Ligand binder design. Structure first.
Ligand SMILES: CNC(=O)c1ccc(-n2nc(Cn3cccn3)nc2-c2cn(C)c(=O)c3ccccc23)cc1
Length: 127
């Protein structure tokens, strides 16, 4: 079995900025979710080899995880907040697509997503 290459966290061809909204996404949003008791399945790319999920990357064609997001924020990969928000939403959606309703992992994603929505609700206005 083989994992795909992880999502890009570095790309000199891609435009980027440092902004207060992206700062908030790191300092408030990412940090809040990262420390949660249920964060651990979402802190790195799904290792379909070690986890014995050979169909994972047949079903999930746009993988995303908070490890990748954390790196993208820290390494200034993004142009705007929407790109980062999209990554979070992709991660949650992937979880719900792959896993069965009522699985623990779905409940775990839900707990993180609740907090995500609470924090994004107060995304600051652009400076
Ligand atoms: C973003 N990541 C995922 O989407 C993900 C990651 C791991 C798992 N795998 N892989 C195993 C190992 N295995 C293979 C065959 C039998 N067992 N078991 C789980 C797992 C299943 N279920 C129902 C859960 O609720 C759950 C909650 C937290 C962590 C793992 C799980 C499922 C989804």
């Amino acid at each position: 079995s083989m994992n795909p290459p992880p999502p890009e966290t570095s790309n000199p061809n891609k435009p980027k900025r440092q902004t207060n909204q992206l700062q908030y996404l790191l300092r408030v949003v990412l940090k809040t979710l990262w420390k949660h008791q249920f964060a651990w399945p979402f802190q790195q790319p799904v290792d379909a080899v070690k986890l014995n999920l050979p169909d994972y990357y047949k079903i999930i064609k746009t993988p995303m995880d908070m490890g990748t997001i954390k790196k993208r924020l820290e390494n200034n990969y993004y142009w705007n907040a929407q790109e980062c928000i999209q990554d979070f939403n992709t991660m949650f959606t992937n979880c719900y697509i792959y896993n069965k309703p009522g699985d623990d992992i779905v409940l775990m994603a839900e707990a993180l997503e609740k907090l995500f929505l609470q924090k994004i609700n107060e995304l600051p206005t652009e400076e």
